[PDB]
Amino acid sequence: AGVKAYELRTKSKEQLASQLVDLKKELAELKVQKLSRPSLPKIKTVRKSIACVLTVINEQQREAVRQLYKGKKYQPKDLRAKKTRALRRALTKFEASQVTEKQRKKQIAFPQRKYAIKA
Amino acid sequence: AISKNLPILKNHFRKHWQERVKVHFDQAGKKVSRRNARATRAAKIAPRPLDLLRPVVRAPTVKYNRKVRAGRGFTLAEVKAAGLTAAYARTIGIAVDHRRQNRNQEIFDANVQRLKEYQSKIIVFPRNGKAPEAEQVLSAAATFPIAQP
Amino acid sequence: PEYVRVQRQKKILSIRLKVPPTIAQFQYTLDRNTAAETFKLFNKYRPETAAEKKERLTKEAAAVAEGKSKQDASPKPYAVKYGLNHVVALIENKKAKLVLIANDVDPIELVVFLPALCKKMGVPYAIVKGKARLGTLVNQKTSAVAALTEVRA
Amino acid sequence: AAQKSFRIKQKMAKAKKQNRPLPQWIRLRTNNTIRYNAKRRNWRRTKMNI
Amino acid sequence: KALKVRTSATFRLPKTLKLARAPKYASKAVPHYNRLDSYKVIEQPITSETAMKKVEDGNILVFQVSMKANKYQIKKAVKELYEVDVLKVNTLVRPNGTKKAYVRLTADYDALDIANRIGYI
Amino acid sequence: GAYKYLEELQRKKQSDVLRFLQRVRVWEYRQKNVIHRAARPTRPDKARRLGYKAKQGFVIYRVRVRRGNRKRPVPKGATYGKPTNQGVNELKYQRSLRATAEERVGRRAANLRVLNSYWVNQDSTYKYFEVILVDPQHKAIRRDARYNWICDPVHKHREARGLTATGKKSRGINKGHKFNNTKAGRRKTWKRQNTLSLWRYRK
RNA sequence: UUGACCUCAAAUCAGGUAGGAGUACCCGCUGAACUUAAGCAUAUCAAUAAGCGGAGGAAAAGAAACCAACCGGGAUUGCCUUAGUAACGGCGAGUGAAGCGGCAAAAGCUCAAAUUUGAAAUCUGGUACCUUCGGUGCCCGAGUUGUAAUUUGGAGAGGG
RNA sequence: GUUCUUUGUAAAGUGCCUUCGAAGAGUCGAGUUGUUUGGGAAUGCAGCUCUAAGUGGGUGGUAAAUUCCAUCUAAAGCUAA
RNA sequence: GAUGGGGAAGCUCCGUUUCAAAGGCCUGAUUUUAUGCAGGCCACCAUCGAAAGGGAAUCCGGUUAAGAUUCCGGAACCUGG
Ligand SMILES: [Mg+2]
Structure with a gap:
């Protein structure tokens, strides 16, 4: 019981x-x-x-x-997420998606085109 | 040691050669996974033909200069004669090699003609809208074969 | 302590050795009266601070909103030029009218070529006391060089 | 020794608690392969080495 | 200008203002409860015949006590759990690894009266 | 631009101005610790050419290492072997003094990442290097996509794995016919050409 | 007297980070001898075992200070081959790659060295608010002994 | 695929003329010593000594002088399969 | 046997007061008050290392199947406050 x-x-x-x-x-x-x-x-x-x-x-x-x-x-460490030490030390999505403005200009000017080949 | 009338053998097995023995048991499974990788890549790039267009080019030495074969990429002079920039050619699927030169007019004309036929054969989609689906082929090399002159 | 001992014995050694004339081309600095009046002249031409820059940009944005002048509502600035590559390019382009070189740049090889370059290009130079003085002239901590290139009437 | 350390006395206490025969109801369980205490230790026959 | 007079050839490290910690977040953020309270320092009585001889003859209760507890904690928790003033506490560690406490009570209280109030006699 | 003046002045090392300046600075560097933090680069042109930028999170240490050969650490010179291995004195270390300098600097500051190093001074006893280090936890390097590649965990202790410039120089990593032993890794090539390859249908 | 600058410290200062394990594969250092030569010392075993330092799901290498000598090729890696060959070797025992060719996979790139000089345009931190892998405002600070924009040799820049 | 924001008086590309075109140093290289390599008058690496140039430098598997030619662009850096 | 340092490719080695800016001690003053500022004093310079060395203080009588200079009765002593 x-x-x-x-x-x-x-x-x-x-x-x-x-x-x-x-x-x-x-x-x-x-x-x-x-x-x-x-x-x-x-x-x-x-x-x-x-x-x-x-x-x-x-x-x-x-x-x-x-x-x-x-x-x-700055919340306490036992309240914030645990996942692994390496994943906590890894770059965030924003920092990983940081790009230089020169590369951003090149990516806007010449992106990978979608194309097909028969006619 | 030395014995009856036999040829002199040179068998290099005096190291610990049994520590480095690679037996390719995974030939069949590696081929299967290789075909799986090709199919999932084609599904990922679902309209595009899985390989870039390569130029025709003359093989280097005196043993092989009688033959012609495929190169790494087109010359910047070749793509300027074809009438499109190198960045645009790289985006629409043409391999560009910045470090080979044109000293042969026949090879230059063949590569320019090959680029003209590629630009006639492809369909380039608009970047924003309708995407008029067009049933990919898987080999630009097979649709543009390398022909011996 | 050792940091006190090193910083004293270093300036002891720098005069115990026979210095080659590119150094001690320095250390004949400007005298204090002419230095005071040249800093009094240079204090009239001071670069704009952050707050007055900010209100200058608000005035420019309002002016291009109302009258659409091509960022030409504000008058032409008159400021002292600073920064080492900037003033070396000014001296090489013969645009500098008067160049002041700090006497205590702690790699001295940053500024040993500056008097010879000024003499070759015909720009008048003065070795003056105080990179901190040049820095508080141009609203920095340390400036190590200063230049008047174009002065008001 | 009489003057012993607490670590030694703790290990002695654990070995004293381990010094017992098999509980007799263990043999009645289904798929029981345990017949006796195979880790039994006596002070005359083998030493703890602690 | 004039320099500072120094009456000693020794140079000492100057005294610096040392601040106290002002953390942005708490260390563990939930303070732990009482690790060793009155219900944990007193596990159960020992009711062997040797122990039961003491409870009318010596006016001494015998308890089994957690190994982390000292005589202050034993005395305070006996006073809190049974509302009895105690005279003295003598502890030992038994050869099985537990801790035994002989608590001799004051003369006002009777350990025989308290033991069957607890529930063992 | 003062930096090309600094370079082409720095190539005149036996000019009197540079040997006086070298003579003062080598005493100043002996008076400090073996490893100590430099406040600013002595050669800012050389630092920024190797990749330093004057922003928060770029650190310069100064380091001296002992010159000369590597004595074989055997008791009383006894090697216990064939006479081809009895050499003790004239043996040379396969890595460089620059490499062991930046490796000691990395062990001193394990939270940093070694970028490059450069020679500053020398005497008969010591060689003096300045090591550029970048902090991979500082937000100015977490952002700034030109430099956030150093925050990837595959770049832990590049100087210990020989991935810096002098590390690749000492490992022999270069294109060409002069580098056939050491081109993709010496031990990798040795395993590749000492492997015995057997197929299912034996050729 | 006061206020800076430079350099060096101290704090249970605010926030972080390193160590140890595992170690089949990977990147380095260091490093033998048994054995073979029918003895043995160079050689061989072997640039191996043992020892030490350092990573990842792969690592390393990688977009030529390349290969070539041809009608020239064109980042790296791997397989088949070149090849038990050119070459090294008490020229003894033994050792021994690379270019081309076919294939698998294919992908390119960026800093330093330029005056923004009609406006350090750049960035960390703290605080307040918010839609919080972050954004905005404000405030210190970093930084002219150079942080942004512009260019990387295939080029490219300044004018027209 | 459907929807909302218009990014942006911004950014990028392309043709012709003209003036230019900055390109990494105790490094490259050389001697010597040790080790290593198939590398042989010296394959790479490292110690010491000497120490550059800018139509320059490196390589072109026999050392050296002289005259050419060919091919790349070091001494800084990232990158999937 | 750490530290400051100095070797060592490194596992680690030397050294123990050394080429160190190496700390704490009492009175208090103040009674927004906390403990800074009034002061003043002092320079050893980690720590480990003896159940036979040094060292604050307990004796007698009784008691159990098995404990006692430890429990019970009586009579003391030392240290800290
Ligand atoms: Mg040595």
């Missing part, structure tokens, strides 16, 4: 923090019962629910920071 992320996403951060601390209290109360009982499979659901609550809290905070840094250069 456990908690559901889509219904966790509608709450505020204080309710999420309180739900997290009651989940941790429940996990401690199950861990003190695990030593007396032979098996206790209910611990795994509480563990995964704690993971779900932490994931929702982190994604809410990260989205708030993204909207704070929206529409400006």
Whole structure:
């Protein structure tokens, strides 16, 4: 069972923090019962629910920071794209498509014509 | 070592020659991929004939000067006599060689005539509009064969 | 420190050695009274700053909008010429009327040929103190040369 | 030694936890080929070399 | 002009105004939560017979504690989780790699009363 | 144009003006570090002929290297082989002092790219070079399509792979019958003419 | 006294970048000996193995300071051939390319050296806004010891 | 293919006459030494010494002097298959 | 055994206070106040290297299946504030 992320996403951060601390209290109360009982499979659901609550809290905070840094250069490095080191160091499309004005004049004057050959 | 009446052999296999052995197992697959590359290039340049027009030109040495063959590109003097600039000829599909010269009037006249027939045979499309599709041929060399005089 | 020691011992060495006359053709610079009055003359002919250039272009654009003069609403400029290749071309074309050469160009081989060229082409030259002075004359940091080529009446 | 470093004690703790026989329910799984702990170590027979 | 008087033959590097960092962007942009809080420093009690002899005789609770925790964190978290004032903490590292903490409570509180409140006896 | 005056004056190296100027500058360059940053090119005409432009992102370093042969680094001169390989003293390095100078400059500034180098001075002990370097992260070189080819990752350490002017000179890359051993790469040609080619239908 | 310039520094200054791995193939440096010569030292193995530096999906080379000697060809690369040839070699053992010819693929180019001189026309950065692989305005700065436009020898420039 | 912006009083090309036509230096080259090459009175590379010219320079596989001829344009740079 | 430097094609080598612009210390002053500006002092000049060298300070009694100068009871001491 456990908690559901889509219904966790509608709450505020204080309710999420309180739900997290009651989940941790429940996990401690199950861990003190695990030593007396032979098996206790209910611990795994509480563990995964704690993971779900932490994931929702982190994604809410990260989205708030993204909207704070929206529409400006120099956003933080973990928020900007990852792809690879070489693709990050590669030239952008604008810089790669930069051409001299002399070559631009030559390309406008003499572009590669489309032609066919029968008649 | 040396033995019965046999010719003296010179087999150069005293290095680690087995480290450099190229067996062309990929002849058939390389031919297939080569035809695939030709077809996709033709589809990419879908009206244009896949190769430029080459001049007729006289082969260099005394062993081969009896024959005539294809050159790299036309002389600037040849394209000026044909009546079009070198940049325009390069855009409409004529190979231009800036570094060969004309010392032979027969070769010059043959190349000028060859350019005249090419300009008569091609259709140049307008740069903006209708593009009246015209069912490409794939070999300007086959449509303009090199003829021995 | 070593940079202080190098910059002192370098000018020590440059007079310990017997300099060949193309150098110490310099270091007889202009005296301070005539230098002050020639900079007072040159200060009247100063190149235009960026802001007055910008309003000059707005006035030119408005004038070609209203009357369509061929960029000839503004009068003919009278400014000091600067820049090394520019003034060498002016001296070779005999257009320069008076040339000032800074005495402290730090490759000296940029300007050692300039007095001989001025003497051959007949242009009067003066070795003057201060590439910084020439730079603040032409609204730069360093100018290393200056030239009056055409003066008002 | 009695005066040991924490790295040595950590490796000793890991080897003490590894020192156990096979769990007996492993043999009941389908397509099980594991018969016994083949990586078992005893202090009299082989040394850790740490 | 006159030069500056120097009473020492040594030349030292002059003192320069050193500014503080004013970054254009944050370093990690989400500050991490508490790495080692009260629920992570106290894993579970040890309920072997040797440990259970201590809880009425010595008035000492025995807990299993994360290996990153020290005595200040153990004491603060026992005070926060169980609302009990503690006398002292003695820790050891067990031979299985875990950490065990003997927490001796003050005389006002009874560890036997607290252990079955927690849920083990 | 002052630059052709600077060139044709620079060819008179044993004229008294140039040997005085050389004599002062070689002392000034011994007094500095082995590798240090030059503020401006000493020969701006030579720099801009090799490709320098006076804009942001063009860097000049000055460098001196030790002259002479390369002593074979063997303990006490023992080579342990046939007498044809017993030479220690008169052996020569196959690359140039200009090449090892710009390679040390590139190792000093690995974030830059080596463009060219030129001789400035020498004495009995050292040879002095000035190295032109371009910053491939500066936006004035990311833009300006005449120079943004240096930002392509195939040009990392051209001076280490021998792709500069003196590198190609030392590798022997030139057209002609005098360069049959070294024309497309010496080891490439050696592999090409030491390969044994066998076809499916054996010729 | 004050304000510049040049040169050299310092900052947990604003923003970036390098290192290491992998390494079949690629670009260089460095560099043997076993072996063969029926011994062995030049030679050979081999401009190889080991060692070191540096890249990419390919790399390198590349648009002639070329090949030729002909009725001349025309960037580079690769295949077939030239050819086990010309040549080198205790002329011993052994080594050993290149031009032409046919084919695969084909593609060309740009800086420096010129006065814009009737107007540094050029560019990084910061800030504000926007449609954000960037654009516009403003402000410092770089730069005349030369950043833009114009030309690259096949040409081309200034006038008419 | 369909649509919006008119780029642009801008840019490019072509004919004839005239005056010109800037073209890379401790480099080219030479001696010597070492290495390398099929390269042989010396194929390339590198060290040291000497060190250019501008109808010039390089190459033209036997060294040198003299007279010609042919063919390119170095000492700066990019580029797919 | 780094750094500043100097060798080395380079992996790296030398050197440890050297041809270095090599730093921190207390009082405070100010009480937009933060810690700059008032001051003044000092020139070693990284760091690693001993469970037998140097070194702040704990003893007795009891207690466990297995721990104790470490736990319990009593009685002390040192360092920092
Ligand atoms: Mg040496």
